[PDB]
Symmetry: D3
Subunit: 341 residues, 6 copies
């Protein structure tokens, strides 16, 4: 008879909607606990002796670094398999690879385009698989983000988080869905063209009706920002993206500047700014210089003033990438005793 009890052990983490509010909060709180342990020098090698594969079909170095430092702190050894090292379903079926990866490694991180690849990995490897970012979901960023909110405010339910800018990018989609599950009010403040899809809004609405989260999807700043505890943003455009100027044109009214922070009406001690990074907040980059020389644009989604102001939590948030991934890997692979969530 198997007397091991742990509701997370062996589970994959592919999509944040596969986890209940209680499960998400556990992992968030576990992350804050391990953050405290690491600050104090308290050992927590729950993955002692293990091997972990870190698959990236596209370079995602901050996520890699979070998974790497997390693995080491837990006593596991991470190996990076990037785009030149691995191409799933290209010359060998994803299923065949999963099986061989699973026979050698104890856990698998997967970052790549297809959610379906993540699922086959989870189905066939026989080991926990963690989604480091797909086109559909970004669960590790969500864990970090809500950990950061709770780190600052102490209690998630009934707080308001406002995302400004592209309400159709996959971080906004994840924030809307994850906030709904957790009972956090979510405002998406975007141009109409970039409102979340009906499919995304429906998934979020389903969860919100059970949690009591209020969800507002609007192109009006003043309506959107009022009451926010968190103002969150992300980049408007990519490296030589299509319809670049059209996107910038429509997005520029939704820049997080100090006026936007004022529009919330929220007291200073109840308001923070978040950004999943990288942020175009100045011209300190090669890209930044080029954009300026061509358009005279000096900041995009956030002003430097806000980025460097007392509201700023994006650096704590980026550190929390690591602490949250650590709790996730530990819950899921460390054979810890967790009889109940």
């Amino acid at each position: 008879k198997d007397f091991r009890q742990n509701v997370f052990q062996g589970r994959s983490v592919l999509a944040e909607k596969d986890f209940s509010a209680a499960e998400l909060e556990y992992l968030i709180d576990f992350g804050l606990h391990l953050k405290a342990l690491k600050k104090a020098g308290i050992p927590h090698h729950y993955l002692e002796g293990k091997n972990i594969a870190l698959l990236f079909e596209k370079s995602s170095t901050r996520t890699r670094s979070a998974f790497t430092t997390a693995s080491i702190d837990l006593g596991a050894h991470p190996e990076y398999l990037g785009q030149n090292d691995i191409q799933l379903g290209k010359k060998e079926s994803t299923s065949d690879t999963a099986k061989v990866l699973g026979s050698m490694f104890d856990g698998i991180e997967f970052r790549g385009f297809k959610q379906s690849d993540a699922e086959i990995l989870a189905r066939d490897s026989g080991v926990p698989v963690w989604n480091g970012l797909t086109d559909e979901w970004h669960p590790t960023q969500m864990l970090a983000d809500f950990m950061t909110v709770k780190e600052n405010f102490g209690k998630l339910q009934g707080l308001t988080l406002t995302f400004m800018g592209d309400g159709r990018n996959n971080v906004a989609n994840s924030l809307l869905v994850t906030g709904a599950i957790l009972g956090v009010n979510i405002h998406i403040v975007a141009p109409k063209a970039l409102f979340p899809t009906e499919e995304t809004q429906n998934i979020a609405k389903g969860f919100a009706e059970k949690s009591g989260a209020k969800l507002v999807i609007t192109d009006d700043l003043d309506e959107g920002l009022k009451g926010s505890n968190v103002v969150y943003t992300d980049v408007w455009v990519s490296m030589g993206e299509s319809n670049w100027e059209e996107r910038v044109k429509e997005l520029t009214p939704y820049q997080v500047n100090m006026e936007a922070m004022k529009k919330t009406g929220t007291p200073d001690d109840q308001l923070i700014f978040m950004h999943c990074l990288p942020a175009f907040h100045n011209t300190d980059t090669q890209y930044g210089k080029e954009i300026k020389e061509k358009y005279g644009i000096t900041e995009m989604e956030v002003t430097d003033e806000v980025f460097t102001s007392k509201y700023a939590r994006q650096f704590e948030e980026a550190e929390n990438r690591m602490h949250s991934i650590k709790a996730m890997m530990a819950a899921t692979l460390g054979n810890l005793f967790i009889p109940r969530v």
Copy 2:
């Protein structure tokens, strides 16, 4: 702000009454979880880098071995201080010693006569203190015993444990109170002269009113034994004890033989024999042979036939000393994330 959550962390374990049924069950289940891990060779060095002081006012080598091996499995180093090494309250106050011990060691085991010494250790050391046996309580034995019961039957509540023999020895006292807390029915079957004291009985009664445990103290063998899922015993006489012959004479009718096992009415798959050991079940000892010449006794509290029967779980129960101590130390000192019991 401390985001560490653990209801056990830093707590001492001096008395089983100081723990709720849910806390006791957690520690039992954790012991079973950890027993599995060790069997599988899954690492669990939760006390990595730590030092532990093991104090013994009297030799208690089975308790010592259990704390020792448990400490090593957890990553901690134990140092044994016995009767020739330490004499708490003899020349230096227990308070003074407790403060010094606590400044060098991360945790302290104490086995000695005075509960007050255990309490002072806990009050002044600043570290977890674990009671390896006092005149008043034996909590590690209780964790091992109810762990053993659960390992065999599952669900503890509603089962029936019967202690037969000296109903006033400290294991019987502990079993009565602890079963009462856990909702396990407890029968003490003893001579009238060796019924547990009014205080022990009334402490147990207070817990039983809330848990639903049925408590029976009786001199009637057939009333006592009926319905038992466990038949538990212990030595009749100890260390050339006073009133020796009288104790044996009042006690022998309460020997655990196959005929006693049959009086329970219980089927082979719902019935086990337990004994905290050492046991006088044969003539295989210097003490045993002397008792045969003087008294014609070849077995005392349990016959060799019961001790070697299909019902015997005493050797499992004794290994469980180690696994249960490990759960206790781990929960209390490992800085594990335990938000809710």
Copy 3:
């Protein structure tokens, strides 16, 4: 006076022909023992504190992974140096690189085209060098493969292993020689155009005289397959290979299908299928889809039916890459006592 005894210690593994049947069996048996150890969670950090350099002139991720996870299980830390990181003999002589490498690392894996590079590395580095694949030899694969055969059968001598298809591919060449050294009967069933070379045949014939191995090279399916304990195949064509249609047409009759298994005559309890992977057994790849569209071909060297049947050992054999490499690195660098092979 050096009282250390180990026949493997400090030796490079560059070519399977460089070791006797006794030495190869020891490594194989060592691998099956270590596999057992890992399954039981039994520690074996024979390479504790060591650094290992993994050189790959071309991407070879399955091999990279086996070496990585093996290193870690043994307590050594592997660093991957791939094509963008190293070019032996391009800018700096392979000899100079070997010396510096050998001065920092404790062992060196090399995968590259030229056997002479493996030899210069072994000659000049001063550390064990392991050939992860060259144009001439694939020793670690042969270790995995015969470990797999023994895992299924026990005594290797007198068994029959049949490779079907491109009998000129370096896997088939290695199998012929290694099976020859080991006293395994090797059958190569290939169109005459793809028979092993006279040089390959002559090397294997030398070893087989002494071992008693029966070598058969034939284009006749029925004569080749008859009495096979193992049916082994590999890809007909690689990434954008010349003579593509020629190769596919001549190799098509040598597809491992259920009829091919049936042709062996061998009872179910004496017959396995093996494939060094990746295999084209279905249409679950981008490549597989392009072949199905252009040619109507759905499966090549092995049918999905054989691939997913009770005969299939590919995935065990693939896992065994790791266990076999661990034995090889352990014998060769672990400073283990091995007085006699």
Copy 4:
């Protein structure tokens, strides 16, 4: 050529007069550094893999515990060899034993009566030997004590330390000699009968004339106490010691009470109390009760008021036993780079 540089490595620590002020201060400062490291959770396993013998001819459990916890923190394993385990020069010559101890262990602690035994151990073992207390010297207590003074005041030279009571016991002798080396003024306030010997005073006077330490040996409280930064004491009598009443009679005027603390004229922020322990400061012990029942004596060398007052540093001092022994073992055995003191 040996490029290792460390002026302490391989040296024994048998007598504090064998070390210069610079060497003593280094070890003191090193102790405060390692204390900081341990509080912060910073690893410092400088004796990783080592075995250490802890010899005690007489039970000295606080010293054992300091050596034990120190060894573990440094990564060394301590084994306790007490009076029933070892009798030097009894049935085997001390020299023969030293040689065998030295061939198995990496370091040796020795606590026993004869300084000459310590020296033979140091001469013949080939490993560092540390004196845990002999009739002649107590170097580990001195390291702890001056570490404690520096921990509180920040700079040893020109401070005043006053020992009150038995100026002939070996801690007072060591304090006088060690204070002289370090440039700390030392007052010994004792009855004339218990003034330090001429031999001890001469050793101290020799060192003091080079350091500029002032040394006062007096039976006058008011002369002795004035200007003290430290008031230090120790027990007047042993367990059933000879001339017990005569010693108590002469010593009782030299009790450290609150009046004595006042006699210093030192401001509150520049005054501390020290005691090497155990202290008879109340009646919380078996011995304490017995002394009271026979003499009505309730406190001896220090009052409870002083022991529990804001001047008290004896518990920090007792913790520092460990931190100081740790620096001593690390300097002397860890193969650290220490080119200069």
Copy 5:
């Protein structure tokens, strides 16, 4: 299917006669290899994570130390349980103790009088049990001793080892049997009253027939010493032994002096002296002084001159206790691959 191969794994070492010459040489050779490893700082934690119980019915500190330091070098943690801690078969049967011991610890050292206790431990504990000395056998000493001979000479077979003095002492008995198994010629030079028993002589004669060992038992010094490669002795009398003066007088002519070495005829490069220790070779003991005063005796079984001469290997042999025990514990518990001995 268990693919683990190891002839020693799980086996107890209770009596040297229980192992073949091949097995004994392997252990010996394994010891010299591990000694080399330790001298080079090469890791070998083959017992990583294990707990070991060290039982001593009587104080035996040199043996205790060898086992302790060996355990630690191998990664296992030893706990000492001495006379005040354990009394096998006194209160509790040795069988019951064995079972519980075996359930917590991974191996068990036993030093005690009764061989039957060693056997019950091996039979009931379920773990390897190592005999650290019984009335009948001293295997670990024989391993140290022949390791020492091989360390000096190479090929053991055909060598001559001569024990001088009490040919009835259990060292001499073990040497006769072990030398017999190994094909070493054994000479026992003893007064006729102290010849080995007929039982001891007959055991050794059985083994010598097959090994070709020449056994000589004689009271003639010149015939016994002739051709010796090793002159080995041990104490004439123990702690308060009866027949003291009788024993000393009859044994006095068998003192190992320089004349005894000269009597061998053996060239300096082929002659060593050995003594299992402690040795009475001078007057540097309390005991030695009492013998000098009472009897004028200054040296007994060996002169200081021989003890400190170019022939002396006692201290190497003593260090070798450790290296030989490490090999024995490593072979028997390390789960090392040993397919053939």
Copy 6:
């Protein structure tokens, strides 16, 4: 109150000018001390549990291997981020990245073009940053080189090091400034066109006025070489460089041949050859062969004869990359006690 003392702890190593001669000597000597330790297998896991980021804007595999092996020997885990992984200042500011890197990693290596990027890394990361090579400085190469000089000669001050060839390449620049700081006489022997810039010369001059170093920049081979204890060179042309033919033509008279070694006037025991590598000393490379066909050159900056002569120390110098980096990391991150340099 922080009683931690270490002058290096937390400092970055961006430029050799930022360190005093005494600090540089300490790190050199520490490197030699640590080289001995590793040779002896003495543990020195000073960075136990740490994570280190190794950034490379361009491939630099010898520098990488040195940081990697050094990290592992110290107990730290390195992760390599190369040109396809990280692009500092391209899309995210170096400041932003530095902050994130520093929140996850305990230390950062940086190899890239801009010194300003190294400085920003140091300013904003909050961790030690080590310069693995910029356009302006190469401090780890300098530590390795002067470590090598001292390893051969001892005393650095008063010796003479001569760099021959391109007197403007960054190794020559570094050698001039660093020798100047350390009091080593430096001769640059170069064509006039390749004399070090006025700035490099004037920086060196400022250090030489204080140290007593004699600096000579000259085109005269015989004036340059005379009195040299070291002849040091480096490649003439790099990565299909511009002005290629002109560089070779002005450079060839400055080749290191045996005749150059003889012009020093220095005896065989006071003279060594150094080269930071890779070296073009033969035709054993693809690049070498092309240069032979196009130019008739079979060797460039150094002949094979000098490269393989008794003077050659370049392979020692290259191993020393690792040991010197280890000293740097250890002093800067190990939290070692270093009160005074």
